[PDB]
Design an enzyme around this catalytic site. Structure first.
Site, PDB file in Angstrom:
ATOM      1  CG  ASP A  48      -3.920  -1.855   2.744  1.00 44.86           C
ATOM      2  OD1 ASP A  48      -4.079  -2.161   1.602  1.00 44.86           O
ATOM      3  OD2 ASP A  48      -3.560  -0.910   3.349  1.00 44.86           O
ATOM      4  CG  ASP A  89      -2.193   2.610   6.348  1.00 43.31           C
ATOM      5  OD1 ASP A  89      -2.433   3.787   6.839  1.00 43.31           O
ATOM      6  OD2 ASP A  89      -2.665   2.073   5.292  1.00 43.31           O
ATOM      7  CG  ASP A 126      -1.592   1.234   1.347  1.00 44.44           C
ATOM      8  OD1 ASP A 126      -1.563   1.708   2.434  1.00 44.44           O
ATOM      9  OD2 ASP A 126      -2.555   1.779   0.857  1.00 44.44           O
TER      10      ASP A 126
END
Ligand SMILES: *[C@@H]1O[C@H](CO)[C@@H](O[C@@H]2O[C@H](CO)[C@@H](O)[C@H](O)[C@H]2NC(C)=O)[C@H](O)[C@H]1NC(C)=O
Ligand SMILES: CC(C)CCC[C@@H](C)[C@H]1CC[C@H]2[C@@H]3CC=C4C[C@@H](O)CC[C@]4(C)[C@H]3CC[C@]12C
Ligand SMILES: *[C@@H]1O[C@H](CO)[C@@H](O)[C@H](O)[C@H]1NC(C)=O
Ligand SMILES: [K+]
Ligand SMILES: [K+]
Ligand SMILES: [Mg+2]
Ligand SMILES: [Tl+]
Lengths: 268, 39, 992
Positions: free
Chosen positions: C690, C686, C345
């Site tokens: 995700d 985070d 990410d």
């Protein structure tokens, strides 16, 4: 193939052949040096045989010899081992002044044939007649058990002195030259009868010390025949034969450390 | 000795055990010292 | 099952308000009926998420109790009770042997069960975190009246109302809104507030303004909407199910464990039954044939090995806990070391997640600011009088403020009330000009025009702090081009000057460059109003232009971005040097995604996309050979119409990959794509978007401070300080533990041979039993334990971060080379050293090696209390047994003595001990404690009864010393050959 190619399969064989060959050669080398540090006449340690064991001829199934008097093949098992032992004490086996010697027909003192050396031939052992074993096919009724003190090189079995009280209090106490053997069971439902050298219920000290198989082959250890002409029948009788001495001790674990454990039963 | 060679069939297993246990303990302490040089 | 959930959603934001009501039998104004709502409740079911069915801990514990070694140990334990049963019936045996050994072995299985159970842990509460995002209550309009209801009682069709501060209770079709802004970070990972209005604004429902989603929250304003989806049927409720439902799967380390279990189990059953028949042929009673088998079992199974592995893992996890890296699953300690691909990410992972000033354009010059958290860069400018003029506008033309009580925390980390751009500017000036509040006190604001959608600028009028003036200063900021159309002069190095086409072109250049860096650019200008035309009491009208807004002085430009975390660029390079492929997977827009990719090193300098080639060469993209482009940037909207085979080609054909504007399922798809190619993949993230990817990853790593609760539930590892450098440490630790496990496994296995061989020679030679069954357990469960563990503290033999990731198909934890060394070479030398001491003990007590062959018959005969030794002496039963057990004790101690050398040689696979040294203090501890244990077990009174351990004479300890030394020399010579010729012979044969 499985793992590798032929060339690799070969190389792995050539390696392990030389490798294990070397290892075997090294192992053998360490065995050589071990033997080189040892005597031919006497073992390095003797503390593990120290207190002599007392063993008998009747091969006990489990410290027991039960049978039927009114049956032939009921005791023919115990007569096999009994014969095996006494067959060794033949007179034809003890011939000539070599390597046997006529010793006192009465319990005598020790005999030192020098040291544990080869500086002399075969150390001459005392003769022993199976004919000293009075009364004892064997006892088809009321067995005639044969006792024996385990051989230990350089061991001098020392009898107890009549200073204080004794089990068989002072009776036929040949204090100086006899290692006594008194069998027991309270529970006194038997009839103890002992046979041996000089007619004594012990081991004649003239058969000691033992010089070992290498320095004394054909050597004969003293026997003590014991007969139980008990007037009882059809019951397990726990009879314990005990030897007494200064160098004799016992253990709760080793039930053969200078004593017997016989469970006779004339179930007839 | 001659007939008085009783020492031949004897071993001081008691002392050996005392010494063996001393050694085991001291090796145990030494180990702690080296381990505890930082935790 | 979940293949449906891996697809993009379909919606009804295209319908009119009225049309949407027909579909749900609803009123736009009155809302549903109390009766109709209750009807729909029973129909559709509750507005709630149901957690997936879990496997009870019962079945989880017992599943370990039947895995190769435990199976063999069970066969042993029962076979003990078998022989015991056969005894209790036949001849009354007052002993406790088979009974107790059967109890001991069954305990070994149970305790070993706890260790593997502890290792195979799965702490997962995904669905629980999602459930926490549904509010307890919602506001609905029913029978023309608004009431709060249990949010679970919400159904498709009713009229819902939301306002700033509340969670969206369900997926809504916006029908009415007033200044409504929403936080869609749940779906995008981006927290910038998104406007919501009734008007449809995009074909894509995840981008349109007239849809509000469950799992998000209203940040400001008010809105009303019609519920279109409830519970599991919402967009993120499906993500919940997908994430919670995904099959966990076996880790790389777990697969390795099972693999050597098969190998060792194989040789165990082989030799087991191979000698069971070999005994019957020799005329051994089944009574004995089973007793030998039990011994064979105990000899072959390394009883303490699986627990060693667990402890070595645990100890490695403890070290990482001490670097702010929490491991939730013990196995994840190793996966990072085996990782070949990282899917990361961007926002809050690679980046700080905070709009930060990156560059400034003043004095016809581009200046760069420091974007790092801890400010690890340098200054750009302080001297220029222009800077102070720009700095003043950034502070004054700003309505952002620091929250109360932050004076303790660093400037860049403190919470700010305001939009992201104003916060960035606030923190910029506060940092390099001190207290901004001071500047706003020295220059009192009298009138302002806040940033307007139409004006595209924000202006403010302040009392000049200067005493010699104390007059009125005008400042404004806004769109760079709009600010330009309102300027006549430029503050160059202090003094103003006319805005000639020259500087105007340099402005465009500066503007294009900063924008190209993916940075948001703002214009700044001011104007000192004429004194005579503006008295100390002159009133300014903010509603109607009461003052000039043209012919102003342009001061400068400022650019900003959500920047990388300080450690990220360097960590990315380090991952790439270790041969790990790094891919970006983000919900953010492509221009921003690509710019950070270059910033952190995902896309290296010079590498191009097909679009880059086309623009440079000024040619159509179809005219570009796509193989000429090693880098690519894929938008989620295009990803959606690509098959997995085509996704696989993208993955294969590019070294530098950026997946932008991806949905949560799309992240999962990319992860699966990478895995499909046979790669071990890590995910770093985070956000709640995700969660699926983190779950599917071989190892998911979540950020601890910035991470959402969901992401940290889905992960195997948490970075508690958000230190991305920890990934680099993690992969390094992972590789080190992999090598050290080999060392520890070889060490443990090596001692199996000296435990097997005595039992074999017992049969083939008919000699007294050299070593007992109990004695074996004193080794594998006792002495070898601490030494085996200590190998986990071994330093690397070379630069492990310099090698490529292991090939999980070829590079195994236990291979043929390990067995050859442990079983064929070193263990064989240990066996002999054991036997030697055995022959020494017996020969020194009177039983010379020659007379031992074929004596066991009379030796074990309990009724022969007169066995003749080599010297003609007669032994009772218990007497010779004491010597025999003393043989077991010295054979045992011989193993310990030969394991000394083995411990030292297993220290290194390649290097010499003279190179690696002896700096492992745990290992040395192992040596001392191992020897202490052995001595204690031999000399402690009473141990001769409980374990049949007998006191050893001093000379006995030294029997195996020459064998211990040969091991040290042999292995040292062998490894000397390895190093001296990287060719292969010694290497490809023995190099673990
Ligand atoms: C040791 O003495 C025993 C005494 O019983 C011998 O047994 C003799 O066996 C033969 C042949 O089987 C019989 O004819 C005799 O009746 C047995 N007794 C005697 C006194 O001769 C036995 O053979 C002897 N063993 C050896 C090796 O000489
Ligand atoms: C007690 C004694 C008699 C048993 C001796 C067993 C010997 C023959 C065994 C023990 C370990 C074995 C080796 C272990 C490892 C390998 C590597 C593998 O890729 C091929 C087989 C090979 C080379 C084995 C061949 C046979 C081997 C050398
Ligand atoms: C033993 O045998 C002798 C003959 O040799 C006999 O006189 C005696 O009665 C026997 N003794 C016993 C107790 O039976
Ligand atoms: K995972
Ligand atoms: K082992
Ligand atoms: Mg993020
Ligand atoms: Tl073992």
């Amino acid at each position: 193939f499985l793992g590798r190619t032929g060339s690799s399969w070969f190389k792995i064989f050539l390696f392990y052949l030389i490798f294990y060959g070397c290892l075997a050669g090294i192992f053998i080398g360490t065995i050589q040096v071990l033997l080189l540090t040892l005597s031919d006449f006497e073992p390095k340690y003797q503390d593990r045989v120290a207190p002599p064991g007392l063993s008998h001829a009747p091969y006990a199934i489990k410290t027991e010899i039960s049978f039927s008097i009114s049956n032939p093949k009921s005791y023919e098992s115990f007569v096999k081992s009994m014969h095996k032992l006494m067959d060794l004490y033949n007179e034809s086996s003890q011939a000539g002044n070599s390597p046997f010697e006529d010793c006192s027909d009465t319990p005598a003192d020790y005999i030192k044939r020098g040291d544990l050396d080869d500086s002399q031939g075969q150390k001459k052992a005392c003769r022993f007649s199976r004919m000293w074993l009075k009364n004892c096919g064997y006892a088809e009724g009321k067995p005639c058990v044969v006792a024996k003190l385990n051989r230990i090189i350089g061991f001098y079995p020392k009898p107890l002195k009549n200073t204080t009280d004794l089990p068989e209090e002072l009776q036929a106490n040949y204090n100086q030259y006899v290692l006594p053997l008194r069998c027991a069971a309270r529970e006194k439902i038997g009839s103890i009868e002992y046979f041996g050298l000089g007619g004594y219920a012990g081991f004649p000290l003239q058969y000691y010390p033992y010089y070992g198989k290498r320095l004394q082959k054909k050597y004969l250890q003293p026997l003590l025949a014991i007969q139980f002409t008990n007037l009882t029948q059809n019951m397990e009788l726990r009879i314990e034969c005990k030897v007494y001495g200064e160098n004799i001790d016992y253990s709760e674990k080793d039930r053969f450390r200078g004593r017997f454990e016989v469970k006779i039963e004339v179930k007839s | 000795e001659g007939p008085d060679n009783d020492e031949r069939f004897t071993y001081d297993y008691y002392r050996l055990r005392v010494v063996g246990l001393i050694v085991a303990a001291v090796l145990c302490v030494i180990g702690i010292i080296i381990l505890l040089a930082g935790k | 099952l979940d293949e449906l959930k891996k697809e993009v959603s379909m919606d009804d934001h295209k319908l009119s308000l009225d049309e949407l009501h027909n579909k749900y039998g609803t009123d736009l104004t009155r809302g549903l009926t109390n009766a109709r709502a209750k009807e729909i409740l029973a129909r559709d079911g509750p507005n709630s998420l149901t957690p997936p069915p879990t496997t009870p801990e019962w079945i989880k514990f017992c599943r370990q109790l039947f895995g190769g070694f435990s199976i063999l140990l069970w066969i042993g334990a029962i076979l003990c009770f078998l022989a015991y049963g056969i005894q209790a019936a036949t001849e009354d045996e007052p002993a406790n042997d088979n009974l107790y050994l059967g109890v001991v072995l069954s305990t070994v299985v149970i305790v070993t069960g706890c260790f593997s159970y502890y290792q195979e842990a799965k702490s997962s509460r995904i669905m629980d975190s999602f459930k926490n995002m549904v509010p307890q209550q919602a506001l609905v309009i029913r029978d023309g009246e608004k009431s709060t209801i249990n949010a679970e009682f919400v159904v498709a069709g009713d009229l819902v109302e939301v306002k700033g501060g509340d969670r969206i209770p369900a997926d809504l079709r916006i029908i009415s809104a007033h200044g409504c802004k929403v936080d869609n970070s749940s779906l995008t990972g981006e927290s910038e507030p998104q406007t919501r209005s009734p008007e449809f604004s995009s074909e894509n429902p995840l981008e349109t303004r007239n849809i509000a989603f469950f799992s998000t929250n209203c940040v400001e304003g008010t809105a009303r909407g019609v519920v279109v989806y409830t519970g599991d049927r919402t967009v993120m409720g499906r993500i919940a199910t997908l994430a919670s439902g995904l099959e966990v799967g076996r880790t790389p380390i777990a697969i390795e464990i099972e693999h050597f279990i098969h190998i060792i189990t194989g040789v165990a059953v082989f030799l087991g039954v191979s000698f069971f028949i070999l005994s019957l042929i020799l005329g051994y009673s089944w009574l004995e044939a089973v007793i030998f088998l039990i011994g064979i079992i105990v000899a072959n199974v390394p009883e303490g090995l699986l627990a060693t592995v667990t402890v070595c893992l645990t100890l490695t996890a403890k070290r990482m806990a001490r670097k702010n890296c929490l491991v939730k699953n013990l196995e994840a300690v190793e996966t990072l070391g085996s990782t070949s691909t990282i899917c990361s990410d961007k926002t809050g992972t690679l980046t700080q997640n905070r709009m930060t000033v990156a560059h400034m354009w003043f004095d016809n010059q581009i200046h760069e600011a420091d974007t790092t958290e801890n400010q690890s860069g340098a200054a750009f400018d302080k001297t220029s009088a222009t800077w102070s003029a720009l700095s003043r506008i950034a502070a004054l033309c700003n309505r952002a403020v620091f929250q109360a009580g932050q004076d303790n925390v660093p400037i860049l980390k403190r919470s700010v009330a305001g939009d992201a751009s104003e916060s960035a500017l606030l923190k910029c000036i506060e940092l390099c000009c001190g207290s901004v509040q001071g500047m706003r006190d020295r220059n009192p604001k009298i009138v302002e025009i806040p940033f307007n959608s139409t004006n595209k600028y924000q202006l403010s009028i302040h009392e000049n702090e200067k005493s010699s003036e104390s007059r009125y200063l005008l400042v404004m900021k806004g769109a760079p081009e709009r600010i330009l159309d309102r300027c006549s002069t430029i503050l160059l190095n202090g003094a103003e000057e006319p805005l000639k086409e020259d500087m105007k072109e340099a402005f465009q250049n500066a503007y294009l460059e900063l924008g190209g860096l993916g940075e948001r650019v703002l214009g700044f200008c001011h104007f000192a109003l004429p004194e005579d035309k503006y008295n100390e009491g002159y009133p300014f009208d903010a509603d109607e232009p009461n003052f000039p807004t043209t012919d102003l002085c342009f001061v400068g430009l400022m650019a900003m971005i959500d920047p990388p975390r300080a450690a990220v660029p360097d960590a990315v390079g380090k991952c790439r040097s270790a041969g790990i492929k790094v891919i970006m997977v983000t919900g953010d827009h492509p221009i921003t995604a690509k710019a950070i990719a270059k910033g952190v090193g995902i896309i290296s300098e010079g590498n191009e996309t097909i679009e880059d080639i086309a623009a440079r060469l000024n040619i159509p993209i179809g005219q570009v050979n796509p193989r000429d482009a090693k880098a690519c940037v894929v938008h989620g909207s295009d990803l959606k119409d690509l098959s997995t085979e085509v996704l696989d080609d993208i993955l294969h054909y590019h070294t530098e990959i950026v997946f932008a504007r991806t949905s949560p399922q799309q992240k999962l798809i990319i992860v699966e794509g990478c895995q499909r190619q046979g790669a071990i993949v890590a995910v770093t993230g985070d956000g709640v978007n995700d969660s699926p990817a983190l779950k599917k990853a071989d190892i998911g790593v979540a950020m601890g401070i910035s991470g959402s609760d969901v992401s940290k539930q889905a992960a195997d590892m948490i970075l508690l300080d958000d230190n991305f450098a920890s990934i680099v440490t993690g992969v390094e630790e992972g590789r080190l533990i992999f090598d050290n496990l080999k060392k520890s496994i070889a060490y443990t296995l090596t001692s199996n041979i000296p435990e097997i061989t005595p039992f074999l020679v017992f049969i083939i030679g008919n000699v007294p039993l050299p070593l007992g069954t109990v004695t074996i357990l004193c080794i594998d469960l006792g002495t070898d334990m601490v030494p085996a563990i200590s190998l986990a503290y071994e330093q690397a033999e070379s630069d492990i971060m310099k090698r490529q990731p292991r090939n999980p198909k070829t590079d195994k934890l236990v291979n043929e080379r390990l067995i050859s060394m442990a079983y064929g070479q070193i263990g064989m030398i240990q066996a002999l050293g054991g036997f030697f001491s055995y022959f020494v003990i017996l020969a020194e007590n009177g039983f010379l090696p020659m007379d031992l062959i074929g004596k066991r018959v009379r030796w074990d005969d309990r009724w022969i209390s007169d066995v003749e030794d080599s010297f003609g002496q007669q032994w009772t039963y218990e007497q010779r047994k004491i010597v025999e057990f003393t043989c077991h004790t010295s054979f045992f101690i011989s193993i310990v003595v030969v394991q000394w050398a083995d411990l030292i040689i297993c220290k290194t696979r390649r290097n010499s001990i003279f190179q690696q040294g002896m700096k492992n203090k745990i290992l040395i501890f192992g040596l001392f404690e191992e020897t202490a244990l052995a001595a204690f077990l031999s000399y402690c009174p009473g141990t001769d009864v409980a374990l049949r351990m007998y006191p050893l004479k001093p000379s006995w300890w030294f029997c195996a010393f020459p064998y211990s030394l040969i091991i040290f020399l042999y292995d040292e010579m062998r490894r000397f050959i390895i190093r001296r010729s990287p060719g292969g012979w010694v290497e490809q044969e023995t190099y673990y």
